[PDB]
RNA sequence: CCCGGCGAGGGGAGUGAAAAAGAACCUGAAACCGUGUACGUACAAGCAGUGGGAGCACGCUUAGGCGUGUGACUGCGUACC
RNA sequence: UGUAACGGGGCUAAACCAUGCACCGAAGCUGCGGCAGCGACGCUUAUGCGUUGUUGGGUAGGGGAGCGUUCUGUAAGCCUGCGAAGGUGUGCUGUGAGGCAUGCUGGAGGUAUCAGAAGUGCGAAUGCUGACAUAAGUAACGAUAAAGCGGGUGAAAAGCCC
């Protein structure tokens, strides 16, 4: 229910994961603070959209916020814009800037 | 004239996908692994149904010569008495009669025994 | 294939495949190893079996009966509707019509018609004398048939 | 008789052989030329 | 030097098994301000064991 | 009470009202087979032991149906000496089911 | 169909012998059929069908010949220079209770059933033991 | 209309037969990377499969028992050209 | 390199030379069911309707019979917005290459039977093009001339301004 997405962001689809896979199952309330006080860039995008799946839960669907929940929570890979390095002996190294999609879902229950 | 072998190709990968499920790496999500997969398991089931008669063979006459030697009596000594007493009876059916109706083994080992000496 | 003839690369040390010519046809828009030429498929046919053919394919009408003989077969005035309704008339819908003289009014009402075509008794073909359904001669076309036959 | 009925006779038109299709067909990669010849090369082949 | 097959998934997932994040423990809560803030480190306002030092 | 009787080579041991698979039978599909070929019967501590066959062991079944059997692949192949066979079978089975069982 | 063995429903019972007076390589085998379940009909492949055999006086066994001064038992550490040499009296003497579980263990099939088969032989070296309560039955070789 | 940097992006409303047709836009497979459910796995050695096969979960059960998925254990088995 | 010249455990026979009776032991032989070829014989052929015997490992290679795709004629025919081609699953079937039916997505063409012509079937050629993994979140982030602090703007500053 009400779920919120974050496409084409600045960032890999590997170090996500990390802040993402510890907030799982947890509350809004627990889930907003463990964000704030972690250290990686992240964490800031991650509460980017939990706070826009909580504000479209209580606009839209007239839901609460002490009973809101994260219920699912997913981060897949997106397009990888490709640049060159340059490189010793006119070598050339292909670089990925990779991206991400991060979904969140916040259930009632 | 132009034919184009995308849906055939696809078809015919897909099958072996389809033959190779349940494989563990390449070998049940790409098509150079799995086709000497699917070939190397045939190549087996067709000496291990040979493999399973042998073993099941094996196993009978193994749980005969356990209802033998519980009995009193060897099982080439059993084989021989049944043969000289003429019957008939099969090494499955033997050890399925130890397993479950012991005392039929007992009249059968009797019966080998009495034409035996 | 346009291009240049130019190894795009030296023989040895570099560790791929070797390459001749950018035009070769494992390549990408490169060229075709069997490419085909404008070539003539007409084949030759002994002027006896065509014979043999057509006097074959006319007996297995004959047999079949969807081959019919009308002493007049004319229309009045270059138009469909008096075609339509002969055809109507004699219950035929994809029929082939041949005459020894060609009829324009009968030509011009047969023009617009898909299952109905006129042939002189020179210009028939065993293609169409299977094709169509039912087929009508006159008979100043099968005395003209019969003498280009025998 | 009409076009959808119409065959030709028994053992006139033969299928005709094709080099280097398949394993199953009997023409296998060598497609009959043998093993790294003169008689196996393309426009390798001796005059008469 | 380099590998001479290919890893698996398997591997890799083992690898980055050790590789996880650890959350925080527990907050601490400001006796006067009722803030929740980082153990033994001031508030965002200036907090502090219940003083004022911004 | 089982007995045991042969039907194509191999023996099977049965009881009353038991279904059995068999090889393939040229009798109808709701017809009636005796089986007077029996090697045993036993019904609680009286065993009848034929030598080879008992003197009036019958056994009537009634042919439930026919069928073919699971598909099996076969597959041979030899190892870089350009080789590969590929082989279908489906077994012909009879399906029956034991009537009754006399001495 | 063939029957097989379930090892919830399979029942094992407990037998003690004495190794006075025998020797290892007619009592080791007894030891290994009746661990596997040879001389049950309910026999299979892969199930432990066996029974619990305890065995006393393991110090008493009897060995003809001169292995007692002849009867070695290699083993390596892993280093490069690790290796060691025994002899019977040696180990009668150390470690006697494992002069029947080396032979029990090369006569048993290698593997975690194996394993499992050789986990039930409480062997000891005197003529009693703790496993009173388990109700065991005395056995001939 | 709301979140969000007066953003990027997305969730609502609206048009449209269709918005997992939203301009990275018809159909959108495979390699590859993810989330959820069932089973197995931390005393166990090897082309990772095959034959036998306990147990577990789900849905029909004419309760019989089968099917699907998992595959403790066990015999055999050192990829292709 | 570590027992290391019975496979191992172990064996005073469970070793050897002599006698006999049993058993295990292969895709070898026998029993049941099924497919195909050659040849004999009466099928007055339906070229197959019963027999009978026999054969059927296979590289290079030869011969024979076939499956699948594009297009063309049959076809201004047939199916199809009451859902085509294609994609993804299930079931059934044939000795086989394959075929049939259908659930869902897909949203407009496809094509029976019989014949004809091929750019007609890919796993390899350090094959070409495009995409995506691996090593890996590893090295590295480019002269060891050097930075620290206080204010300002800003959502956020060690790097922008004073
Ligand atoms: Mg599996
Ligand atoms: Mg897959
Ligand atoms: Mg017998
Ligand atoms: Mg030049
Ligand atoms: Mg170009
Ligand atoms: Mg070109
Ligand atoms: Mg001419
Ligand atoms: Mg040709
Ligand atoms: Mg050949
Ligand atoms: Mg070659
Ligand atoms: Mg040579
Ligand atoms: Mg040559
Ligand atoms: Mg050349
Ligand atoms: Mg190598
Ligand atoms: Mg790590
Ligand atoms: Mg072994
Ligand atoms: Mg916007
Ligand atoms: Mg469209
Ligand atoms: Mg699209
Ligand atoms: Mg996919
Ligand atoms: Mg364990
Ligand atoms: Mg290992
Ligand atoms: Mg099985
Ligand atoms: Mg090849
Ligand atoms: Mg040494
Ligand atoms: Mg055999
Ligand atoms: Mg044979
Ligand atoms: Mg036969
Ligand atoms: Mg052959
Ligand atoms: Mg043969
Ligand atoms: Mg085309
Ligand atoms: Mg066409
Ligand atoms: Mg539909
Ligand atoms: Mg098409
Ligand atoms: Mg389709
Ligand atoms: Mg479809
Ligand atoms: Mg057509
Ligand atoms: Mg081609
Ligand atoms: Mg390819
Ligand atoms: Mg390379
Ligand atoms: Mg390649
Ligand atoms: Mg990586
Ligand atoms: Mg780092
Ligand atoms: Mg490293
Ligand atoms: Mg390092
Ligand atoms: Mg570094
Ligand atoms: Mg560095
Ligand atoms: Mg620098
Ligand atoms: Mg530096
Ligand atoms: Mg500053
Ligand atoms: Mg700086």
């Known amino acids: 229910e009400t779920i919120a997405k974050h496409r084409?962001?600045?960032?890999?689809?590997?170090?996500?994961?990390?802040?993402?896979?510890?907030?799982?199952?947890?509350?809004?309330?627990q889930a907003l603070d463990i964000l704030t006080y972690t250290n990686?860039?992240?964490?800031?995008?991650?509460?980017?959209?939990?706070?826009?799946?909580?504000?479209?839960?209580?606009?839209?669907?007239?839901?609460?916020?002490?009973?809101?929940?994260?219920?699912?929570?997913?981060?897949?890979?997106?397009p990888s814009m490709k640049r060159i390095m340059p490189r010793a002996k006119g070598r050339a190294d292909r670089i990925l800037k990779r991206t991400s999609h991060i979904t969140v879902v916040v259930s009632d229950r | 004239a132009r034919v184009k072998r995308g849906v055939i190709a696809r078809a015919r990968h897909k099958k072996i996908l389809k033959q190779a499920k349940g494989?563990?790496?390449?070998?049940?999500?790409?098509?150079?692994?799995?086709?000497?997969?699917?070939?190397?398991?045939?190549?087996?089931?067709?000496?291990?149904?040979?493999?399973?008669?042998?073993?099941?063979?094996?196993?009978?006459?193994?749980?005969?010569?356990?209802?033998?030697?519980?009995?009193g009596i060897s099982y080439s000594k059993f084989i021989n008495g049944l043969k000289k007493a003429s019957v008939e009876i099969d090494r499955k059916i033997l050890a399925d009669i130890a397993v479950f109706d012991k005392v039929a083994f007992t009249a059968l080992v009797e019966k080998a025994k009495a034409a035996l000496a | 294939v346009?291009?240049?003839?130019?190894?795009?690369?030296?023989?040895?040390?570099?560790?791929?495949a070797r390459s001749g010519s950018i035009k070769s046809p494992i390549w990408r828009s490169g060229g075709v190893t069997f490419?085909?030429?404008?070539?003539?498929?007409?084949?030759?046919?002994?002027?006896?079996?065509?014979?043999?053919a057509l006097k074959s394919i006319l007996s297995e009408l004959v047999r079949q009966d969807r081959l019919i003989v009308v002493e007049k077969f004319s229309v009045e005035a270059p138009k469909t509707k008096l075609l339509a309704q002969k055809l109507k008339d004699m219950a035929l819908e994809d029929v082939l019509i041949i005459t020894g003289e060609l009829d324009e009014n009968l030509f011009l009402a047969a023009r617009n018609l898909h299952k109905v075509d006129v042939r002189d008794a020179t210009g028939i073909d065993p293609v169409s004398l299977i094709a169509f359904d039912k087929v009508v001669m006159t008979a100043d076309a099968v005395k003209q048939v019969e003498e280009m036959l025998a | 008789m009409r076009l959808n009925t119409l065959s030709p006779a028994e053992g006139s038109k033969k299928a005709g052989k094709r080099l280097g299709r398949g394993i199953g067909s009997g023409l296998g990669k060598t497609g009959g030329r043998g093993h790294k010849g003169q008689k196996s090369r393309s426009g390798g082949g001796v005059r008469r | 030097?380099?590998?001479?097959?290919?890893?698996?998934?398997?591997?890799?997932?083992?690898?980055?098994?050790?590789?996880?994040?650890?959350?925080?423990?527990?907050?601490?809560?400001?006796?006067?301000?009722?803030?929740?803030?980082?153990?033994?480190?001031?508030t965002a306002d200036g907090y502090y064991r219940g003083r004022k030092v911004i | 009470m089982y007995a045991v009787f042969q039907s194509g080579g191999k023996q099977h041991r049965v009881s009353e009202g038991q279904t059995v698979r068999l090889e393939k039978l040229d009798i109808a599909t709701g017809e009636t087979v005796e089986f007077a070929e029996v090697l045993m019967i036993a019904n609680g501590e009286e065993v009848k032991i034929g030598v080879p066959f008992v003197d009036g062991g019958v056994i009537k079944a009634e042919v439930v149906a026919h069928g073919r059997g699971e598909k099996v692949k076969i597959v041979k192949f030899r190892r870089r000496k350009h080789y590969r066979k590929q082989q279908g079978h489906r077994q012909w089975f009879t399906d029956v089911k034991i009537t009754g069982i006399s001495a | 169909k063939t029957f097989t063995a379930k090892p919830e429903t399979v029942k094992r019972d407990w037998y003690v012998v004495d190794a006075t007076g025998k020797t290892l390589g007619r009592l080791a085998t007894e030891l290994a059929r009746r661990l596997r379940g040879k001389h049950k009909a309910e026999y299979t492949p892969h199930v432990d069908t066996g029974d619990?055999?305890?065995?006393?006086?393991?110090?008493?066994?009897?060995?003809?010949?001169?292995?007692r001064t002849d009867k070695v038992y290699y083993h390596h550490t892993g280093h490069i220079g690790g290796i060691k040499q025994a002899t019977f009296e040696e180990m009668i003497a150390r470690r006697p209770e494992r002069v029947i579980e080396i032979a029990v263990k090369g006569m048993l099939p290698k593997g975690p059933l194996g394993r499992a088969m050789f986990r039930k032989l409480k062997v000891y070296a005197g003529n009693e033991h703790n496993h009173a309560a388990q109700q065991p039955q005395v056995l001939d070789i």
């Open chain 1, 8 to 29: 084409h962001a600045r960032s890999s689809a590997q170090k996500v994961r990390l802040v993402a896979d510890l907030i799982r199952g947890k509350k809004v309330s």
């Open chain 1, 40 to 78: 990686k860039k992240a964490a800031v995008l991650v509460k980017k959209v939990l706070e826009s799946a909580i504000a479209n839960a209580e606009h839209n669907d007239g839901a609460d916020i002490d009973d809101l929940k994260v219920t699912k929570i997913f981060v897949d890979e997106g």
């Open chain 2, 23 to 71: 494989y563990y790496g390449a070998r049940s999500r790409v098509y150079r692994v799995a086709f000497q997969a699917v070939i190397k398991a045939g190549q087996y089931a067709y000496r291990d149904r040979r493999q399973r008669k042998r073993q099941f063979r094996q196993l009978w006459i193994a749980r005969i010569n356990a209802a033998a030697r519980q009995n």
């Open chain 3, 2 to 16: 346009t291009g240049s003839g130019k190894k795009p690369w030296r023989q040895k040390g570099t560790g791929r």
């Open chain 3, 35 to 52: 490419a085909a030429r404008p070539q003539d498929h007409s084949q030759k046919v002994n002027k006896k079996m065509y014979r043999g």
């Open chain 5, 1 to 42: 030097a380099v590998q001479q097959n290919k890893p698996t998934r398997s591997k890799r997932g083992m690898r980055r098994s050790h590789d996880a994040l650890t959350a925080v423990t527990s907050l601490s809560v400001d006796k006067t301000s009722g803030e929740k803030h980082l153990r033994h480190h001031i």
């Open chain 7, 52 to 67: 619990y055999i305890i065995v006393l006086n393991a110090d008493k066994v009897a060995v003809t010949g001169n292995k």
